[PDB]
Amino acid sequence: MVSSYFKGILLNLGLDEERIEVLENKGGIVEDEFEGMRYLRLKDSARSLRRGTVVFDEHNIILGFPHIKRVVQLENGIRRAFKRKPFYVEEKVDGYNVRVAKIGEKILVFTRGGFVCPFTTERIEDFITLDFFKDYPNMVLCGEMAGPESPYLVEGPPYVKEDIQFFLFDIQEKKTGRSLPVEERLKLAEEYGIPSVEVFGLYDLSRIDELHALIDRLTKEKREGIVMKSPDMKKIVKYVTPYANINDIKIGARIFFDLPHGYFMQRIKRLAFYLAERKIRGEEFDEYARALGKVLLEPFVESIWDISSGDDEIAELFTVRVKKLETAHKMVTHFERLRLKIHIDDIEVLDNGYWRITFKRVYPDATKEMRELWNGHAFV
Amino acid sequence: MVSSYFKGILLNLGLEERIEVLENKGGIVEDEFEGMRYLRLKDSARSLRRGTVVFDEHNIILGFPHIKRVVQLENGIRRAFKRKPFYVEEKVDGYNVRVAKIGEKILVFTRGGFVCPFTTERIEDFITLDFFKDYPNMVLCGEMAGPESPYLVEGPPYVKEDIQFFLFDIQEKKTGRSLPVEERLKLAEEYGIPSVEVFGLYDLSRIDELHALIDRLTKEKREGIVMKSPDMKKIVKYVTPYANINDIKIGARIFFDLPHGYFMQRIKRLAFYLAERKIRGEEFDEYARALGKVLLEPFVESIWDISSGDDEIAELFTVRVKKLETAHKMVTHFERLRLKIHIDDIEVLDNGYWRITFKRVYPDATKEMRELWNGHAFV
Ligand SMILES: [Mg+2]
Ligand SMILES: [Mg+2]
Ligand SMILES: [Mg+2]
Ligand SMILES: [Mg+2]
């Protein structure tokens, strides 16, 4: 299933031969390839090797990016995680996660599951300079790709007016995955001109009222929230705005079916805890209640009306810019391997010579369930 | 674990290897009420649904079948009934009971096959027993519904106190076969058995009057309808937007540890009603405000509750009983069902009945809600 070459490295990393075989049998480790380079991808977690870890050889091991725990009550979440000790507060940028690393003679960009993104890898030199990897070839840039022309999202931060951008939020060591302290990472980002998430400053529990004011401002500005980090990067907690929760519901409600478990309920819970913590009442409360009802029902009702007349499927349209037409071809192939039903809907050349590719992703299982229900299917 | 007497009947009913798996896994269990032992089917086995109870070779009470719902009324009718006629009955919001003569006793069973000590002791208050003198092999299936219920905190608006029985089926022992609608209604009248309201005989061509009926039931805070072919072979339910919104209001006080999809299924049902009826503008906005309010207001109120104090999320509800012993039997029964319920208040009514106020607490929902309020971090 997977070569003993890769199993050999997993052993040198301390993994047990018996565990390696179980992972191989269950598909928890799989082989993949990008432009001729073979690598092992961890679909499941293995000891200190997180999901999304990729292995090319004994040195080129890129650990998966760790999950970040959330709090839904900000003040008490800070007291529990940080006590009264200081922490950095960074913008949580709404995009997709990437890890950028020098592998052999190539710069590869890995998405969260450990796939090489052909779009982001081809265009990485538009978003960052590569001087960093000349000096720090054993280091991994971790960041968010975010913007209005994204291959993976249909929303983004409001200050990105076109195309897509990189926002550094961590620098990690190969093989160990160890994060540099915040201050060192920011010094490297400035030294190399690497675009960074916005750092709002150093805060602590005693400054909770300013943090609430920050959340309210990010809400009005249609931004997602914050990530709180101890200076040594050992404690990390996220917290999202009510806008993030309401807009996610709006986007998701067009599809409604076949979404991750709890997608809607978790966000309703996050809204209720925000409303409780901030003691919002009266007319202000009613505005949130009306907004929640609207984003649950209006996009869903609109899709029911759509699927009730015709053979059209529920779809999302999105665009990206590419330098070479071949890249668009590589994306369609990549989208299929990821089991997504995506095709090219439109192509245009821009005034700067980039191709603007409009993709259409359809949701056939969600469409089928919605249409069967509309056509009167009876269920227990 | 389970007697060879009961396993023998299960075999005579068509179930031998499956019987042993059921015994080992606890899918069939033995129970007892006032000295009568019976087998209860905790899981379904072939044509024997969950809630089937077995006392002997003859006294077999089949579990009540699930009823499929439609969320799009006009197309659901076209699919289920085509253009053939069907009866339309009120769906009464209560709990399901099966009433049967077992030996010399009249026992009342809830959906899972437990004898309800409350409904069994008081059954003569809700129905007459003449029916079982003439039809001892028949089972009355009905809804117990009202403002003083042991199992619900809502009920139909036209029941002003206590609780009432509403007949909706008459089934044969052992076979579970339902009598045709017209025959069940004639029996209900002959024996004075209270019935669910029958709105009449409808068909697809009368879909606009059915919509008008739904709108009236919503305005009157009633749950919906059950549609039945005259031979009882095709049965479909459809609930009002009020039922969906009020269920959410009730559930949102607790939010956690509820059945999977409890909220999402009702939002789905709300959306299909709004689509089918082409509701728009201000009328649409009223439904969106109502949905937002019932999701958030009870939930926020409970967060405020658990944030100031050490109290647990609780529901208060009352019932009337004739004997205090009955209240004692209910507390014991509630514990056996793994519910944290205790007696909060007791009073004697002007008619000599005891009104018992129970308090059910929700320790698992309370703990999760409180941990979240106290800043617990989670993936
Ligand atoms: Mg994100
Ligand atoms: Mg979002
Ligand atoms: Mg019911
Ligand atoms: Mg109800």
- Give chain B positions within 8 Å (CB) of A292: 291-292, 295-296
Q: In sequence order, what are the beta bridge partners of A87?
A: A203
Q: How is residue A273 annotated by DSSP? A: H
Q: Which two tokens stand for residue A319?
A: 């665009």
Read off φ and ψ for residue A214, nearest 5 degrees: -60, -45
- Yes or no, beta carbons of B287 and A268 under 8 Å apart: no
Widest CA span in chain B? 66
Q: Residues A289, B288: contact at Cβ < 8 Å?
A: no
Q: Output the CA–CA distances (angstroms, integers) from residue A315 to A303, A360, B77, B124, B332, in the order listed.
A: 10, 6, 29, 59, 55
A1: helix, strand or coil: coil
Ligand nearest to the CA of B222: 4
Q: How is residue A128 annotated by DSSP? A: S
**Helix ranges (DSSP H) in A123-239:** 124-127, 131-135, 182-192, 208-220
Is A351 annotated to bind a ligand? Reply is no
- Give chain B positions within 8 Å (CB) of A274: none
List CB contacts of A120: < 8 A, sequence separation 6 or more: A98, A109, A111, A127, A145, A151
Name the closest residue on chain B to residue A282, using Cα atoms.
B297
Chain A: give the shortest CA distance to residue B280, in Å: 10
Distance CA A312, CA A303 (A): 10
Give the residue among B348, B304, B80, B317 at the shortest CA–CA distance from B207: B80
Distance CA B352, CA A104 (A): 89
Widest CA span in chain A? 65
Q: Output the CA–CA distances (angstroms, integers) from residue B378 to A67, A73, A179, A301, in the order listed.
A: 10, 12, 21, 33
List CB contacts of A266: < 8 A, sequence separation 6 or more: none
Q: Which two tokens stand for residue A189?
A: 């980002």
Distance CA A24, CA A19 (A): 9
Q: How far is the CA of A222 from the centre of ligand 1 (A)?
A: 14
Q: In the 3-class helix/strand/coil scheme, how is A23-34 assigned residue by residue?
A: HHHHCCEEEEEE
Of A81, A276, A374, nearest to B304 by CB-CB distance is: A276
- Yes or no, beta carbons of B300 and A276 under 8 Å apart: yes
Q: Residues B203, B74: contact at Cβ < 8 Å?
A: no
Name the closest residue on chain B to residue A303, using Cα atoms.
B275
List CB contacts of A321: < 8 A, sequence separation 6 or more: A123, A149, A163, A164, A350, A354, A355, A356, A357
Give the residue among B138, B142, B108 at the shortest CA–CA distance from B124: B108
Q: Which two tokens stand for residue B28?
A: 């069939």
Chain B: give the shortest CA distance to residue A300, in Å: 7
Read off φ and ψ for residue B292, nearest 5 degrees: -60, -40
Positive or negative, the Cα torsion across A276, A278, A283, A286? negative
Give the sheet arrangement for strand B36-41, strand by strand: B28-33, B36-41, B53-54, B60-61
Distance of CA B289 to the CA centre of its chain: 28
Q: Residues B152, B93: contact at Cβ < 8 Å?
A: yes
- Give the CATH fold of the A4-58 domain: Nuclear Transport Factor 2; Chain: A, (3.10.450)
A277: helix, strand or coil: helix
Distance CA B307, CA B373 (A): 7
Is A330 annotated to bind a ligand? Reply is no
Distance CA A246, CA A249 (A): 5
Q: CATH number of B4-57: 3.30.413.10, 3.10.450.740, 3.20.20.140, 2.40.50.60?
A: 3.10.450.740
Q: Residues B85, B203: contact at Cβ < 8 Å?
A: yes
Determine the Cα angle at B190 with ends B184 and B193, to 5°: 70
Q: Residues A119, A322: contact at Cβ < 8 Å?
A: yes
Give the residue among A89, A90, A116, A112 at the shortest CA–CA distance from A104: A116
- Yes or no, beta carbons of B291 and A286 under 8 Å apart: no
Query: Amino acid identity, residue B218?
Result: T
- Yes or no, beta carbons of A300 and B79 under 8 Å apart: no
Distance CA B338, CA B33 (A): 18
Q: How is residue A205 annotated by DSSP? A: G
Q: Which two tokens stand for residue B145?
A: 């519904």
Query: Amino acid identity, residue A175?
Result: K
Given the DSSP bridges, would you call strands A87-92 and B224-228 parallel, antiparallel or unpaired? unpaired
Give the residue among B97, B100, B110 at the shortest CA–CA distance from B61: B100
Per domain, the residue ranges of chain B are 4-57, 68-239, 242-307, 314-361
Contact B5/A at CB under 8 A? no
Q: What is the C-alpha R_g of chain A?
A: 22
Distance CA B34, CA A272 (A): 48
A7: helix, strand or coil: helix
Q: Does domain B68-239 have CATH number 3.20.20.140?
A: no
Neighbours of A129 (CB within 10 A): 12
Q: What is the C-alpha R_g of chain B?
A: 22
Residue ranges with strand state E in A85-216: 87-92, 96-103, 106-110, 139-146, 165-173, 199-203
Given the DSSP bridges, would you call strands A236-240 and A69-70 parallel, antiparallel or unpaired? parallel
Contact A205/B at CB under 8 A? no
DSSP string of A292-309, one letter each residue: HHHHHHHHHHHHHHHHHS
Distance CA B228, CA B181 (A): 8
Query: Amino acid identity, residue B114?
Result: F
List CB contacts of B228: < 8 A, sequence separation 6 or more: B86, B87, B89, B181, B234, B235
- Yes or no, beta carbons of B373 and A273 under 8 Å apart: yes
Contact B72/A at CB under 8 A? yes
Architecture of the domain delimited by A315-362 = 2-Layer Sandwich (3.30)
Name the closest residue on chain B to residue A277, using Cα atoms.
B373
Distance CA A148, CA A319 (A): 8
Name the closest residue on chain B to residue A83, using Cα atoms.
B375
Give the residue among B274, B330, B293 at the shortest CA–CA distance from B148: B330
Distance CA A274, CA A225 (A): 13
Chain A: give the shortest CA distance to residue B246, in Å: 15
Neighbours of B174 (CB within 10 A): 17
Q: Is B302 exposed, middle or buried (0-12, 13-18, 19+ CB in 10 A)?
A: buried
- Give the CATH fold of the A243-308 domain: Methane Monooxygenase Hydroxylase; Chain G, domain 1 (1.20.58)
Buried-exposed string A82-100: b where 16+ CB fall within 10 A, e elsewhere: beeeebbbbbbbbbbbbbb
Torsion angle defined by CA atoms of residues B307, B312, B317 and B320, in that order, rounded to the nearest 10 degrees: -150
- Yes or no, beta carbons of B289 and A291 under 8 Å apart: no
- Give the CATH fold of the A69-240 domain: D-amino Acid Aminotransferase; Chain A, domain 1 (3.30.470)
The residue whose two tokens read 């069902």 is B337
Distance CA A147, CA B258 (A): 38
Q: Residues B313, B306: contact at Cβ < 8 Å?
A: yes
Q: Which two tokens stand for residue A92?
A: 């949580």
Q: How far is the CA of B34 from the centre of ligand 4 (A)?
A: 32
Chain A: give the shortest CA distance to residue B90, in Å: 19
Determine the Cα angle at B291 with ends B286 and B294, to 5°: 120
Q: Output the CA–CA distances (angstroms, integers) from residue A326 to A320, A329, B106, B262, in the order listed.
A: 13, 5, 79, 47
Query: Amino acid identity, residue A187?
Result: K
Name the closest residue on chain A to residue B280, using Cα atoms.
A298
Distance CA B253, CA B261 (A): 16
CATH number for the region B242-307 comes to 1.20.58.2250
CATH number for the region B314-361 comes to 3.30.70.3360
Q: Is B51 exposed, middle or buried (0-12, 13-18, 19+ CB in 10 A)?
A: buried
Neighbours of B318 (CB within 10 A): 18
Q: Which two tokens stand for residue B185?
A: 């209604």
Ligand nearest to the CA of B153: 4
Q: How many residues does chain A have?
A: 380
Distance CA B236, CA B88 (A): 10
The residue whose two tokens read 């009342």 is B108
Q: Which two tokens stand for residue B372?
A: 């979240």
Distance CA A44, CA A29 (A): 7
- Scan residues 210-239 of B and list those with Cβ closer than 8 Å to A: 236
Query: Amino acid identity, residue A13?
Result: L
Of A69, A288, A296, nearest to B291 by CB-CB distance is: A296
Q: Residues A130, A111: contact at Cβ < 8 Å?
A: no
Give the residue among B230, B253, B229, B233 at the shortest CA–CA distance from B315: B253
Buried-exposed string A316-326: b where 16+ CB fall within 10 A, e elsewhere: eebbbbbeeee
Q: Is A236 exposed, middle or buried (0-12, 13-18, 19+ CB in 10 A)?
A: buried
Is B302 annotated to bind a ligand? Reply is no
Of B72, B291, B303, nearest to A276 by CB-CB distance is: B303
Q: How is residue A67 annotated by DSSP? A: P
Read off φ and ψ for residue A15, nearest 5 degrees: -55, 150
- From first CA to last CA, the distance across chain B in angstroms is 43
Distance CA A196, CA A227 (A): 13
Q: In the 3-class helix/strand/coil scheme, how is chain B assigned residue by residue?
A: CCCHHHHHHHHHCCCCHHHHHHHHHCCEEEEEECCEEEEEECCCECCECCCCEECCCCCEECCCCCCEECCCHHHHHHHHHCCCCEEEEEECCCEEEEEEEECCEEEEECCCCCECHHHHHCHHHHCCCHHHHHCCCEEEEEEEECCCCCCCCCCCCCCCCCCEEEEEEEEECCCCCECCHHHHHHHHHHHCCCECCEEEEECHHHHHHHHHHHHHHHHCCCCEEEEECCCCCCEEEEECHHHHHHHHHHHHCCCCCCCCCHHHHHHHHHHHHHHHCCCCHHHHHHHHHHHHHHHHHHHHHHHHHHHCCCCCCEEEEEEEECCHHHHHHHHHHHHHCCCEEEEEEEEECCCCCEEEEEEEECHHHHHHHHHHHCCCCEC
Contact A289/B at CB under 8 A? yes
Q: In sequence order, what are the beta bridge partners of B341?
A: B360
Q: Residues B136, B76: contact at Cβ < 8 Å?
A: no
Distance CA A173, CA B93 (A): 61
Of A79, A268, A379, nearest to B375 by CB-CB distance is: A79
Given the DSSP bridges, would you call strands B68-69 and B235-239 parallel, antiparallel or unpaired? parallel
Q: How many residues does chain B have?
A: 379
Distance CA A254, CA A259 (A): 11
Q: How is residue A237 annotated by DSSP? A: E
Distance CA A241, CA A137 (A): 37
